[PDB]
């Protein structure tokens, strides 16, 4: 059994800044990778960002390459997403994911819980 | 005067001077000079009657004086390794060293007496000559002036004792007073080696800039440099060369001119030292009195 | 002007790395030649650990024809290295002084130079700036290579410094633009030194300096009639401008002229109370794990080959006797074998003293001479 | 030897016979010799040139040593009429 | 002007002795040690052999110890790697490289490899030369709205490794995806080659793959056709 | 196309950074401030190659050896520019009659003591062990300063009559060196006896003595005016007084005159000269440096007229007038590390007093 | 005698990267670095991990920290995209590294899934192989699986991925699953499922038999 919980996000102004967090426990966190997803209303799920094990690579999508900044922490077992230059049309529910592939760089994506980030 | 000691030396022979047991070394002439002084370190003795296998006779003597001569002649630098002490042998070094002075091995029969042995030690300027028995031919014991005074001091308890022992030291001209050889503590070992080769001295009491004696340096202290393999570094000061035995000795055995001669002889034979320096209340060096001058005063 | 116990004097020569001066010991008077390197001119790195590695590396290279390094004295202003001093001067000054030399002396210098260069090659170091002005003579007319590894600083900076700083002595590969120079430069420079010893003049010498580089690039060189064709065939095989056909150490050692007068010590490899007292566990005799009759036969063969006169009461009890050659008297002793166990047997020596004759010489030293010649024959 | 009375007065190296029928073992050495060869007295409290009195049993026996360098250490405790000497002799091989 | 030209490569039978050379031109082989390395397809470098003619000492890896005898000829400046009893695993490209063991500086003992050769490719396989078979890959009839349909050609059971492919639409191509060859369990090779094209053009345009194999003399064409 | 300033790490580099920011505000050319370790050694190896820093800030003792190698540019001062500065500051930067550097400030050593641990400063060098006998029972120390460098140990040696080179008429005599007299022997003997009798620590350098003085572990220290910001940071009740007399004779410290050296290989000579003469030697430029770390007696008389109210700087000027100016000959470059090696060999007990002073006398001018 | 183990990463143009090389035993400063372009010869960059080999300029730099040898590439030019190799020669047996590859940074693109039925020409020959296709997917790392008739079969599938494009920097995967003619009676439908990093939900394409 794994635990997953998000924090942050809410009714914020577009174009400003907003930080999100995601954390898990009960297992080793250094050998697994975290990722972020977006699911727009009326559209399918879309990829946002990913962070590697020890900071090898920070990858983004085509539309969020020069606007979003993802980070991770080893002491507090949390990750961080620095969202900059937000758009009013990008309002959607944001999800966190847990990769269950052990000793491999492959990604098995599953979303436990996600918060509703609705910009004005 | 000396009529009680001269008749003593003429009546009592050198046959009584040899102890019961005695370790004795001889060296082969074809042996290298590097291992001979290491063997003298190992055995502890300071003399070795040499034997020539090609002539079947006692060819000479190899001692600490010869050690001083070879480490003063065949020594270039401290950084340069001394190859000459490694490559030369006893015959090769003695054919160079004995070029000007041809001096055979002087000795005396044990069936002879002590007066002739003391007179030959004084005349030949030799500290250690051995004895050779004519009936056998082998050598028995290496005579030392310290053993002579230890034999003499046991037999001074008679009636004509204050012949000249009650007199002082300044008025009998006992000891060298005209010329004194001194080295500072800052002076290296090599200038003391040069003084040992130039003069016929046997010890150098070190003084400070004022002249106060704090330590003493002798020829016996040289052999520990070959013992601890520091014979190649002869540029260090004499203070670091005298720190080899600093955990054992007390100080410098000083004496005075006003003190009687017999007290000086008793303190000489008690502490088994070869020589003493004379000092004053200001602790300056006025001269050195050794065994070869006290026995010279006794033999006359 | 004071390093260690050495005061300094005049300047022996001029070096592109640093000025070489002479030093004199203040007590003995021994002469030590110290090279003084200017830190302000060239310094690649300031790390003291590389200096420690240099001190660890350069001191362990001992060779009877390579100038030995004594110590490396560190200084915030300069770099000091105390080398040994020679009284014969440079080879090029000797060539300018005496001109043409005999072939038997040129081969004697060339074999020593090759034995130093092969020693450097076996210790993985090359001398890229090799010339007759960097080899020295002693009082005994030998050859001494001055700087074996110091040319690496000249190689480290730029290859243009090698061509411009040394225009006469420069390899064809270096002036052709090879960044890394190997032992082929050593072979070519040794061939130039051999030609200088055999002829006195330089092989490649022009007033115009690019013409001099073009002549170095050209294979042809002048040949006089003084030298027999074997050594000029060796020089043609050795001075090829292409490194594939240039000779090696084995290619010089397999030549006929090199094997005429060859000393054996040049090549180390044949295939191409107060005093301390220490106790000693002394041994009585010889512990031999053999048959006692065979040991008796061995001792009998030894005393037969040493020309002894002997008589036996028992088979194990051997009383031997010899007459001395120079001494008229005779010496008497007796041998006895011991059984300490069933495996090993101990041979013991027992002398008997002379009763009535005052014999000449020493009895006990001749007793040791009756065994110092016997243990060498037995060797057990 | 003129004073000796041997069974064979020849004394010639050529007349050597190892074909003797007798196979008897050599005589066993006394324990005092074992003691003196096992332990050699090296006094440390006194002067290094001073040694205790040697035993009467061994007088003319050689005492060799092993070889580190090319020297050859060998000694014998020679006996005078009353005095006792020990002549160390050092010779290169 | 230093070039390390290799020779003697190609294809061998397993269990046969091969001897490839390395013509060292531009330097001398007597001073420097010629080192051979192994570069498997997909893997990294792997040291296999060494010979040092100056002291006459060789070196070998733990996996090829006592089976691949090295030889050096100082008269022709060549290095002979006589391999014996080769297995099926040893199938790679063999580079030739000189080695500099000398002190370039006073503090740094240089121990690197300066100059590298082009390297010849040896192929070990029990199967002989077999003609290539090309099969027409079929695009699915169903497709998403506004999505392109990819078309390709499948080549299987061929020999050797180099393959040249062409299409009949034009000399120039767009959206081409040439895959590397994979070694299957039956010792032979497999190959895929797909092209990315718009779906609307597929009705008008026609494509024909051109399979060219020069050492097999097989130039066969295969017309792709959309069929369910 | 910029200005590179190298200055020691214990100086006011932030004031130079502010002056460089004002220069970038006025014309657009930025100034890069770097503090390399051992800059007197790192300077000629890049100055010979034609690159590196364009301007150097160092005293005139190394500038003679820099000028003999052709590494310093000739300066062209104005008459009013010479009138604004002190004449002895211009005299101290003379090399064979030529001016080679702009004078900046005068630095001199003074006795710095803790008023909480020692209310009355001593007037005698010999009573310092007598005070240390009382102070070691309290858990403090009397005097701790940098012993690894000869600049701080030079007054205790040269108080009794020691001197570097004899100055008679415009030339320092390279053969008349006063380190082999009786005063230098007595000074080095007292310096050894402070270490052997457990009054001082031989491993004490500038950093450990500074950390001991900021923590209050010592009662007195000998240090320059540049550490006054670190003294004010630790809030220790400090006092600055005249150095005491030794055997009736006062101490003889080196008088240090900070100067500005211009690289001869730099194409930016005119911009650097206008920068210095318009910004640094003014009333507003010195205050930005003085706010970071005080330099002491400045060469500008107009700022010194307001600056002389500080009794610390007055005692510094008194010790400078009772001190001795440094020679600017290139033999000082061989003098410095020779005297440093002599002090290291005498302090560690490896060499005696006479051997170390003989090595300092022999290796004084040349080596 | 010993082994080496470098890292593996990927960055953009001009980024400062580092490559470690953890030596097993205690070694000296005798570690080199070889840059090998694909289909070319390994070029030497730094010979003893601290000083630059002549040739290639000062962009490549290395530091030594005990037995952790580093290779730092500051100001990455767009021509220095090749495979780097650690090399330990101090012990005497030469041992190379595993080899690190430097890939250019690219935005994550959703993969295209294509399914292909086996043609009738290879059905009569007996050897028919089905293949699924992946186009224009970044990163390279992907996991394909063959859940044929809801059964994950492994061992017969073989993958062959290509290099990145010069102008698009896109990968392409080809997983060939070989079968026989007699194995088509049991399994009616086949599915090639892929789990990509940028694909949120794993989608598969299934083609029924007999069309
Ligand atoms: N007058 C003296 N005062 C202090 N120490 C002395 C004096 N004379 C000798 N010694 C010390 O005694 C030690 C040995 O004595 P010395 O050098 O006289 O040889 P020795 O013991 O007489 O030799 P031998 O015992 O063979 O006659 C030396 O280390 C020396 O320091
Ligand atoms: C390079 C060279 C040296 C060196 C060591 N010894 N040495 C000696 C000299 C030297 C220079 C000039 C000399 O004078 C030549 C005239 N003499 C006297 C007359 C007969 C011929 C020889 C003699 C010796 C030069 N360099 C060295 C040390 C370090 N590096
Ligand atoms: N018995 C002797 N016969 C001949 N020469 C001797 C004899 N004893 C010593 N010599 C020589 O006299 C020289 C001086 O020796 P000496 O100084 O008396 O020895 P020591 O230093 O042990 O007192 C020595 O070089 C030695 O060769
Ligand atoms: N250092 C010395 N200075 C002066 N005289 C000495 C010295 N050493 C020995 N003598 C004299 O040399 C003679 C012999 O002494 P010795 O050499 O000890 O037997 C005596 O007259 C000594 O006084
Ligand atoms: O003897 C050491 C050193 O002393 C001086 O350096 C001073 C400098 O003048 C001051 O401005 C400040 O930096 O303190 C330095 C000492 O740490 C001499 O100028 C210098 O030559 C000498 O080496």
PDB file of N, CA and C in Angstrom, chain E residues 155-220:
ATOM      1  N   UNK E 155      12.362  -6.823 -44.354  1.00  0.00           N
ATOM      2  CA  UNK E 155      13.386  -7.678 -44.941  1.00  0.00           C
ATOM      3  C   UNK E 155      13.880  -8.626 -43.857  1.00  0.00           C
ATOM      4  N   UNK E 156      13.877  -9.924 -44.155  1.00  0.00           N
ATOM      5  CA  UNK E 156      14.215 -10.940 -43.170  1.00  0.00           C
ATOM      6  C   UNK E 156      15.051 -12.021 -43.847  1.00  0.00           C
ATOM      7  N   UNK E 157      15.891 -12.686 -43.037  1.00  0.00           N
ATOM      8  CA  UNK E 157      16.696 -13.852 -43.430  1.00  0.00           C
ATOM      9  C   UNK E 157      17.674 -13.522 -44.559  1.00  0.00           C
ATOM     10  N   UNK E 158      18.508 -12.513 -44.327  1.00  0.00           N
ATOM     11  CA  UNK E 158      19.476 -12.048 -45.308  1.00  0.00           C
ATOM     12  C   UNK E 158      20.890 -12.128 -44.744  1.00  0.00           C
ATOM     13  N   UNK E 159      21.862 -11.983 -45.646  1.00  0.00           N
ATOM     14  CA  UNK E 159      23.277 -11.914 -45.335  1.00  0.00           C
ATOM     15  C   UNK E 159      23.901 -11.099 -46.459  1.00  0.00           C
ATOM     16  N   UNK E 160      24.900 -10.241 -46.178  1.00  0.00           N
ATOM     17  CA  UNK E 160      25.521  -9.827 -44.914  1.00  0.00           C
ATOM     18  C   UNK E 160      24.905  -8.582 -44.269  1.00  0.00           C
ATOM     19  N   UNK E 161      25.692  -7.961 -43.386  1.00  0.00           N
ATOM     20  CA  UNK E 161      25.249  -6.774 -42.651  1.00  0.00           C
ATOM     21  C   UNK E 161      24.960  -5.531 -43.506  1.00  0.00           C
ATOM     22  N   UNK E 162      25.814  -5.077 -44.447  1.00  0.00           N
ATOM     23  CA  UNK E 162      25.472  -3.832 -45.163  1.00  0.00           C
ATOM     24  C   UNK E 162      24.328  -4.025 -46.153  1.00  0.00           C
ATOM     25  N   UNK E 163      23.340  -3.130 -46.072  1.00  0.00           N
ATOM     26  CA  UNK E 163      22.137  -3.165 -46.899  1.00  0.00           C
ATOM     27  C   UNK E 163      21.895  -1.752 -47.415  1.00  0.00           C
ATOM     28  N   UNK E 164      21.603  -1.626 -48.709  1.00  0.00           N
ATOM     29  CA  UNK E 164      21.220  -0.357 -49.314  1.00  0.00           C
ATOM     30  C   UNK E 164      19.791  -0.486 -49.818  1.00  0.00           C
ATOM     31  N   UNK E 165      18.918   0.415 -49.374  1.00  0.00           N
ATOM     32  CA  UNK E 165      17.509   0.382 -49.738  1.00  0.00           C
ATOM     33  C   UNK E 165      17.141   1.679 -50.444  1.00  0.00           C
ATOM     34  N   UNK E 166      16.145   1.588 -51.322  1.00  0.00           N
ATOM     35  CA  UNK E 166      15.685   2.737 -52.087  1.00  0.00           C
ATOM     36  C   UNK E 166      14.184   2.617 -52.306  1.00  0.00           C
ATOM     37  N   UNK E 167      13.567   3.740 -52.659  1.00  0.00           N
ATOM     38  CA  UNK E 167      12.143   3.801 -52.941  1.00  0.00           C
ATOM     39  C   UNK E 167      11.915   4.362 -54.338  1.00  0.00           C
ATOM     40  N   UNK E 168      10.703   4.160 -54.850  1.00  0.00           N
ATOM     41  CA  UNK E 168      10.370   4.506 -56.224  1.00  0.00           C
ATOM     42  C   UNK E 168       9.676   5.861 -56.326  1.00  0.00           C
ATOM     43  N   UNK E 169       9.444   6.536 -55.197  1.00  0.00           N
ATOM     44  CA  UNK E 169       8.825   7.857 -55.245  1.00  0.00           C
ATOM     45  C   UNK E 169       9.814   8.914 -55.721  1.00  0.00           C
ATOM     46  N   UNK E 170      11.044   8.867 -55.224  1.00  0.00           N
ATOM     47  CA  UNK E 170      12.061   9.817 -55.640  1.00  0.00           C
ATOM     48  C   UNK E 170      13.394   9.466 -55.020  1.00  0.00           C
ATOM     49  N   UNK E 171      14.443  10.106 -55.544  1.00  0.00           N
ATOM     50  CA  UNK E 171      15.766   9.968 -54.943  1.00  0.00           C
ATOM     51  C   UNK E 171      15.814  10.623 -53.569  1.00  0.00           C
ATOM     52  N   UNK E 172      15.234  11.813 -53.439  1.00  0.00           N
ATOM     53  CA  UNK E 172      15.081  12.445 -52.137  1.00  0.00           C
ATOM     54  C   UNK E 172      13.906  11.825 -51.392  1.00  0.00           C
ATOM     55  N   UNK E 173      13.975  11.869 -50.064  1.00  0.00           N
ATOM     56  CA  UNK E 173      12.941  11.287 -49.223  1.00  0.00           C
ATOM     57  C   UNK E 173      12.710  12.172 -48.006  1.00  0.00           C
ATOM     58  N   UNK E 174      11.508  12.066 -47.444  1.00  0.00           N
ATOM     59  CA  UNK E 174      11.126  12.800 -46.247  1.00  0.00           C
ATOM     60  C   UNK E 174      10.420  11.857 -45.286  1.00  0.00           C
ATOM     61  N   UNK E 175      10.714  12.008 -43.997  1.00  0.00           N
ATOM     62  CA  UNK E 175      10.134  11.133 -42.995  1.00  0.00           C
ATOM     63  C   UNK E 175      10.666   9.719 -43.015  1.00  0.00           C
ATOM     64  N   UNK E 176      11.888   9.523 -43.503  1.00  0.00           N
ATOM     65  CA  UNK E 176      12.475   8.190 -43.581  1.00  0.00           C
ATOM     66  C   UNK E 176      12.945   7.766 -42.193  1.00  0.00           C
ATOM     67  N   UNK E 177      12.834   6.466 -41.907  1.00  0.00           N
ATOM     68  CA  UNK E 177      13.264   5.892 -40.629  1.00  0.00           C
ATOM     69  C   UNK E 177      13.919   4.544 -40.932  1.00  0.00           C
ATOM     70  N   UNK E 178      15.242   4.555 -41.069  1.00  0.00           N
ATOM     71  CA  UNK E 178      16.007   3.343 -41.333  1.00  0.00           C
ATOM     72  C   UNK E 178      16.480   2.755 -40.009  1.00  0.00           C
ATOM     73  N   UNK E 179      16.047   1.523 -39.717  1.00  0.00           N
ATOM     74  CA  UNK E 179      16.391   0.888 -38.456  1.00  0.00           C
ATOM     75  C   UNK E 179      17.708   0.126 -38.576  1.00  0.00           C
ATOM     76  N   UNK E 180      18.457   0.002 -37.482  1.00  0.00           N
ATOM     77  CA  UNK E 180      19.637  -0.866 -37.492  1.00  0.00           C
ATOM     78  C   UNK E 180      19.244  -2.335 -37.542  1.00  0.00           C
ATOM     79  N   UNK E 181      20.167  -3.144 -38.053  1.00  0.00           N
ATOM     80  CA  UNK E 181      19.924  -4.575 -38.167  1.00  0.00           C
ATOM     81  C   UNK E 181      20.028  -5.248 -36.805  1.00  0.00           C
ATOM     82  N   UNK E 182      19.162  -6.232 -36.573  1.00  0.00           N
ATOM     83  CA  UNK E 182      19.133  -6.984 -35.327  1.00  0.00           C
ATOM     84  C   UNK E 182      19.489  -8.437 -35.630  1.00  0.00           C
ATOM     85  N   UNK E 183      20.268  -9.048 -34.738  1.00  0.00           N
ATOM     86  CA  UNK E 183      20.680 -10.441 -34.875  1.00  0.00           C
ATOM     87  C   UNK E 183      19.712 -11.306 -34.075  1.00  0.00           C
ATOM     88  N   UNK E 184      18.877 -12.071 -34.774  1.00  0.00           N
ATOM     89  CA  UNK E 184      17.932 -12.949 -34.102  1.00  0.00           C
ATOM     90  C   UNK E 184      18.617 -14.249 -33.680  1.00  0.00           C
ATOM     91  N   UNK E 185      17.832 -15.153 -33.091  1.00  0.00           N
ATOM     92  CA  UNK E 185      18.374 -16.370 -32.497  1.00  0.00           C
ATOM     93  C   UNK E 185      18.795 -17.409 -33.527  1.00  0.00           C
ATOM     94  N   UNK E 186      18.384 -17.269 -34.788  1.00  0.00           N
ATOM     95  CA  UNK E 186      18.739 -18.222 -35.830  1.00  0.00           C
ATOM     96  C   UNK E 186      20.001 -17.825 -36.591  1.00  0.00           C
ATOM     97  N   UNK E 187      20.850 -16.977 -36.003  1.00  0.00           N
ATOM     98  CA  UNK E 187      22.125 -16.611 -36.586  1.00  0.00           C
ATOM     99  C   UNK E 187      22.088 -15.600 -37.715  1.00  0.00           C
ATOM    100  N   UNK E 188      20.954 -15.424 -38.388  1.00  0.00           N
ATOM    101  CA  UNK E 188      20.863 -14.512 -39.517  1.00  0.00           C
ATOM    102  C   UNK E 188      20.453 -13.124 -39.023  1.00  0.00           C
ATOM    103  N   UNK E 189      20.096 -12.239 -39.951  1.00  0.00           N
ATOM    104  CA  UNK E 189      19.809 -10.845 -39.648  1.00  0.00           C
ATOM    105  C   UNK E 189      18.370 -10.502 -40.017  1.00  0.00           C
ATOM    106  N   UNK E 190      17.863  -9.432 -39.405  1.00  0.00           N
ATOM    107  CA  UNK E 190      16.540  -8.898 -39.696  1.00  0.00           C
ATOM    108  C   UNK E 190      16.647  -7.394 -39.915  1.00  0.00           C
ATOM    109  N   UNK E 191      15.652  -6.833 -40.604  1.00  0.00           N
ATOM    110  CA  UNK E 191      15.690  -5.421 -40.960  1.00  0.00           C
ATOM    111  C   UNK E 191      14.280  -4.884 -41.158  1.00  0.00           C
ATOM    112  N   UNK E 192      14.032  -3.694 -40.617  1.00  0.00           N
ATOM    113  CA  UNK E 192      12.825  -2.929 -40.886  1.00  0.00           C
ATOM    114  C   UNK E 192      13.211  -1.549 -41.402  1.00  0.00           C
ATOM    115  N   UNK E 193      12.333  -0.964 -42.225  1.00  0.00           N
ATOM    116  CA  UNK E 193      12.583   0.366 -42.782  1.00  0.00           C
ATOM    117  C   UNK E 193      11.228   0.984 -43.131  1.00  0.00           C
ATOM    118  N   UNK E 194      10.779   1.929 -42.310  1.00  0.00           N
ATOM    119  CA  UNK E 194       9.490   2.575 -42.508  1.00  0.00           C
ATOM    120  C   UNK E 194       9.704   4.017 -42.954  1.00  0.00           C
ATOM    121  N   UNK E 195       8.685   4.560 -43.621  1.00  0.00           N
ATOM    122  CA  UNK E 195       8.675   5.933 -44.110  1.00  0.00           C
ATOM    123  C   UNK E 195       7.432   6.612 -43.547  1.00  0.00           C
ATOM    124  N   UNK E 196       7.580   7.861 -43.108  1.00  0.00           N
ATOM    125  CA  UNK E 196       6.467   8.643 -42.583  1.00  0.00           C
ATOM    126  C   UNK E 196       5.928   9.538 -43.692  1.00  0.00           C
ATOM    127  N   UNK E 197       4.667   9.321 -44.062  1.00  0.00           N
ATOM    128  CA  UNK E 197       4.039  10.029 -45.181  1.00  0.00           C
ATOM    129  C   UNK E 197       2.643  10.465 -44.778  1.00  0.00           C
ATOM    130  N   UNK E 198       2.146  11.548 -45.383  1.00  0.00           N
ATOM    131  CA  UNK E 198       0.756  11.953 -45.137  1.00  0.00           C
ATOM    132  C   UNK E 198      -0.248  10.946 -45.681  1.00  0.00           C
ATOM    133  N   UNK E 199      -1.378  10.839 -44.975  1.00  0.00           N
ATOM    134  CA  UNK E 199      -2.405   9.864 -45.334  1.00  0.00           C
ATOM    135  C   UNK E 199      -3.147  10.249 -46.609  1.00  0.00           C
ATOM    136  N   UNK E 200      -3.323  11.551 -46.857  1.00  0.00           N
ATOM    137  CA  UNK E 200      -4.059  11.999 -48.039  1.00  0.00           C
ATOM    138  C   UNK E 200      -3.298  11.714 -49.328  1.00  0.00           C
ATOM    139  N   UNK E 201      -1.965  11.755 -49.284  1.00  0.00           N
ATOM    140  CA  UNK E 201      -1.155  11.470 -50.464  1.00  0.00           C
ATOM    141  C   UNK E 201      -1.174   9.995 -50.849  1.00  0.00           C
ATOM    142  N   UNK E 202      -1.534   9.106 -49.913  1.00  0.00           N
ATOM    143  CA  UNK E 202      -1.477   7.663 -50.150  1.00  0.00           C
ATOM    144  C   UNK E 202      -2.448   7.204 -51.231  1.00  0.00           C
ATOM    145  N   UNK E 203      -3.567   7.911 -51.405  1.00  0.00           N
ATOM    146  CA  UNK E 203      -4.495   7.560 -52.468  1.00  0.00           C
ATOM    147  C   UNK E 203      -3.931   7.806 -53.856  1.00  0.00           C
ATOM    148  N   UNK E 204      -3.225   8.924 -54.037  1.00  0.00           N
ATOM    149  CA  UNK E 204      -2.660   9.246 -55.342  1.00  0.00           C
ATOM    150  C   UNK E 204      -1.300   8.587 -55.551  1.00  0.00           C
ATOM    151  N   UNK E 205      -0.414   8.684 -54.563  1.00  0.00           N
ATOM    152  CA  UNK E 205       0.960   8.230 -54.728  1.00  0.00           C
ATOM    153  C   UNK E 205       1.067   6.715 -54.602  1.00  0.00           C
ATOM    154  N   UNK E 206       2.060   6.156 -55.292  1.00  0.00           N
ATOM    155  CA  UNK E 206       2.384   4.738 -55.240  1.00  0.00           C
ATOM    156  C   UNK E 206       3.838   4.573 -54.819  1.00  0.00           C
ATOM    157  N   UNK E 207       4.107   3.562 -53.993  1.00  0.00           N
ATOM    158  CA  UNK E 207       5.442   3.326 -53.464  1.00  0.00           C
ATOM    159  C   UNK E 207       5.887   1.907 -53.784  1.00  0.00           C
ATOM    160  N   UNK E 208       7.172   1.758 -54.112  1.00  0.00           N
ATOM    161  CA  UNK E 208       7.795   0.463 -54.384  1.00  0.00           C
ATOM    162  C   UNK E 208       9.178   0.481 -53.744  1.00  0.00           C
ATOM    163  N   UNK E 209       9.424  -0.446 -52.821  1.00  0.00           N
ATOM    164  CA  UNK E 209      10.726  -0.543 -52.174  1.00  0.00           C
ATOM    165  C   UNK E 209      11.724  -1.243 -53.087  1.00  0.00           C
ATOM    166  N   UNK E 210      12.959  -0.745 -53.091  1.00  0.00           N
ATOM    167  CA  UNK E 210      14.038  -1.294 -53.906  1.00  0.00           C
ATOM    168  C   UNK E 210      15.101  -1.867 -52.977  1.00  0.00           C
ATOM    169  N   UNK E 211      15.203  -3.190 -52.944  1.00  0.00           N
ATOM    170  CA  UNK E 211      16.134  -3.893 -52.068  1.00  0.00           C
ATOM    171  C   UNK E 211      17.395  -4.182 -52.871  1.00  0.00           C
ATOM    172  N   UNK E 212      18.500  -3.544 -52.494  1.00  0.00           N
ATOM    173  CA  UNK E 212      19.773  -3.687 -53.189  1.00  0.00           C
ATOM    174  C   UNK E 212      20.782  -4.356 -52.264  1.00  0.00           C
ATOM    175  N   UNK E 213      21.314  -5.496 -52.703  1.00  0.00           N
ATOM    176  CA  UNK E 213      22.376  -6.212 -52.002  1.00  0.00           C
ATOM    177  C   UNK E 213      23.511  -6.464 -52.985  1.00  0.00           C
ATOM    178  N   UNK E 214      24.621  -5.740 -52.803  1.00  0.00           N
ATOM    179  CA  UNK E 214      25.737  -5.852 -53.743  1.00  0.00           C
ATOM    180  C   UNK E 214      26.512  -7.170 -53.634  1.00  0.00           C
ATOM    181  N   UNK E 215      26.927  -7.668 -52.456  1.00  0.00           N
ATOM    182  CA  UNK E 215      27.627  -8.962 -52.456  1.00  0.00           C
ATOM    183  C   UNK E 215      26.720 -10.180 -52.568  1.00  0.00           C
ATOM    184  N   UNK E 216      25.410 -10.003 -52.746  1.00  0.00           N
ATOM    185  CA  UNK E 216      24.506 -11.122 -52.965  1.00  0.00           C
ATOM    186  C   UNK E 216      23.878 -11.121 -54.350  1.00  0.00           C
ATOM    187  N   UNK E 217      24.049 -10.030 -55.115  1.00  0.00           N
ATOM    188  CA  UNK E 217      23.560  -9.870 -56.494  1.00  0.00           C
ATOM    189  C   UNK E 217      22.043 -10.062 -56.574  1.00  0.00           C
ATOM    190  N   UNK E 218      21.333  -9.550 -55.571  1.00  0.00           N
ATOM    191  CA  UNK E 218      19.877  -9.633 -55.505  1.00  0.00           C
ATOM    192  C   UNK E 218      19.314  -8.218 -55.503  1.00  0.00           C
ATOM    193  N   UNK E 219      18.673  -7.833 -56.604  1.00  0.00           N
ATOM    194  CA  UNK E 219      18.009  -6.537 -56.728  1.00  0.00           C
ATOM    195  C   UNK E 219      16.541  -6.806 -57.045  1.00  0.00           C
ATOM    196  N   UNK E 220      15.745  -7.009 -55.998  1.00  0.00           N
ATOM    197  CA  UNK E 220      14.330  -7.332 -56.123  1.00  0.00           C
ATOM    198  C   UNK E 220      13.519  -6.137 -55.631  1.00  0.00           C
TER     199      UNK E 220
END
